[PDB]
Design a protein around this ligand. Structure first.
Ligand SMILES: *[C@@](O)(CO)[C@H](C[C@@H]1CCNC1=O)NC(=O)[C@H](CC(C)C)NC(=O)c1cc2c(OC)cccc2[nH]1
Ligand SMILES: *[C@@](O)(CO)[C@H](C[C@@H]1CCNC1=O)NC(=O)[C@H](CC(C)C)NC(=O)c1cc2c(OC)cccc2[nH]1
Lengths: 303, 305
């Protein structure tokens, strides 16, 4: 029993983190085979970062301009190219710790594990969710650029995130491993805002099922709602609409607890309209929305 | 910026997790150098666990009764001994991935990363706080016994926890790496209840220092207090009393902010006696008590290992 924000074991990724320095700029890189991936703004100086013409800045660079260190050993750069906001630094040595990996673009509402690194050295691991406005609520300080987010399926690491920026509001933004930002963000040194931060409804419902599986039911009620009437109320509160696909994804949690999805929706509607008073759900005073249905199934199946 | 429950990178521990099996009973063990550590109840059958005599049950076992596997590779057991509730098995191979490590016994309020493991395979990592009642609010399923909790310092992994038990309330109990349980629990198949829990005062204060570091300081008041007077008051609100070590580990955050420890105790005292008055701290109206001073420091300054 029990339910906790849980990340994947990061050992397979820890063996891929390196340090990338260009001039006075340093951040993290991801070393897979004989390629090191890192945010392209490492080639920038403090002045270039205000408005960088990356294609212009990149052509004026040589291989020896890039200092790549894997722990103690320094890796010799024998080529370099750009794929959107990701610099690809070819090296004369293939990482012997390269695991089975793939590059994927995660969907909003989905979760992944982040391996926060500084100076190429892992520092901490935690789980994040790709929010509807394509930001993530992480913990990133100066020098965390180049940190990656990932999921693991058996023996395959699916890389989905590389960190680039912290918005003025304190949330964070980044790209997939092909260098495409999540959201309307750009890698220039400017204050940038995201779209309205809507709540991942299917995740909140999954988290309510987890609370019930762990013996908490004070928020349940005998009322019921139609899918449309629930979505009417949810959208009023800046919640994402619940699709029939979401209803289907919640099936296992419904079968395990015996609470129909539309029954849980009636509970959430009451919570949204009445609040939680001073009560808590799984120790939280707010409705948690960064647990996916699968995150709940993996921790609550058989409980 | 940002504040999260953050676990340590677990690569150094993942390379040490193995599976230990006796008969049909299987759990996790910790492979360090040429010794594997694991809960002693692996030697029990399902019925043995109801009322085991581990000394008697162990006398009937030999080295050849122990199946130790790293993945699918068997590690031949060449020696066995019992230390409290932990079984120590000498194997013929020294773990090449053994990291710098030490065995430590933590205090209530200290946090550590748990590497949840099943059949010797790491499955998840999350941060836990040792409650004052010597339980942890973990997430453990069948086959999780032998999972360890740890901290990482000078490239050294300090092992502090090995999983054994789930309580009826849904919390969890275990031992240190010397087999000594945290709290008054025993490795037996019975429903055992933990004492009444309390809030970890030192961690709440650390969380208040965190808010002040971030410019959120409305709660800072003009009063101070003695350590003794605060402890007597805090206990009336189900808060644990502070020790001299607690005051000392709060030192760095006290110097960083310029707020004396006993001054912030007086501020917390007012929050307990008067409430928040519809206000929040770091975005929450709930006082957080599972962030140690180091966690606040390690996360407000990005220390690596
Ligand atoms: C990377 O480590 C840079 O190498 C760093 C990310 C963080 C810094 C602190 N916490 C983090 O997560 N990223 C940046 O500094 C980026 C660099 C861009 C992509 C070139 N810049 C920002 O994240 C950024 C800039 C500004 C800004 O300007 C002016 C105004 C307000 C917020 C802001 N964030
Ligand atoms: C280990 O994996 C066993 O090897 C397992 C712990 C969990 C199983 C699911 N989630 C967990 O955390 N541990 C046990 O099953 C222990 C075995 C002891 C140490 C011999 N037993 C319990 O945790 C336990 C027993 C009982 C009980 O009796 C019957 C009544 C109520 C609760 C309870 N928990």
């Amino acid at each position: 029993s029990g339910f906790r924000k849980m990340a994947f074991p990061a050992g397979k990724v820890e063996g891929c983190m390196v340090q990338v320095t260009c001039g006075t700029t340093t951040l993290n890189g991801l070393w897979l085979d004989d390629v090191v991936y890192c945010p392209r703004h490492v080639i920038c100086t403090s002045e270039d970062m205000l408005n960088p013409n990356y294609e212009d800045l990149l052509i004026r660079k040589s291989n020896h301009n890039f200092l790549v260190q894997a722990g103690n050993v320094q890796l010799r750069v024998i080529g370099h190219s750009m794929q959107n906001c990701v610099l690809k630094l070819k090296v004369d040595t293939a990482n012997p710790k390269t695991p089975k990996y793939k590059f994927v673009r995660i969907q909003p509402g989905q979760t992944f594990s982040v391996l926060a690194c500084y100076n190429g050295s892992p520092s901490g691991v935690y789980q994040c969710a790709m929010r509807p406005n394509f930001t993530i609520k992480g913990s990133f300080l100066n020098g965390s650029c180049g940190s990656v987010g990932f999921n693991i399926d058996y023996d395959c690491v699916s890389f989905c995130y590389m960190h680039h920026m912290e918005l003025p509001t304190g949330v964070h933004a980044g790209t997939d491993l092909e260098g495409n930002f999540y959201g309307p963000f750009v890698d220039r040194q400017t204050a940038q805002a995201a779209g309205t931060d809507t709540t991942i409804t299917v995740n909140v419902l999954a988290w309510l099922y987890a609370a019930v599986i762990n013996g908490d039911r004070w928020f349940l009620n005998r009322f019921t709602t139609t899918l449309n009437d629930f979505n009417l109320v949810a959208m009023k509160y800046n919640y994402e609409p619940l699709t029939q696909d979401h209803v289907d994804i919640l099936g296992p949690l419904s079968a395990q607890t015996g609470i129909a999805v539309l029954d849980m929706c009636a509970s959430l509607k009451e919570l949204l309209q009445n609040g939680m008073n001073g009560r808590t759900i799984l120790g939280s005073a707010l409705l948690e929305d960064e647990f996916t249905p699968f995150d709940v199934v993996r921790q609550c199946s058989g409980v």
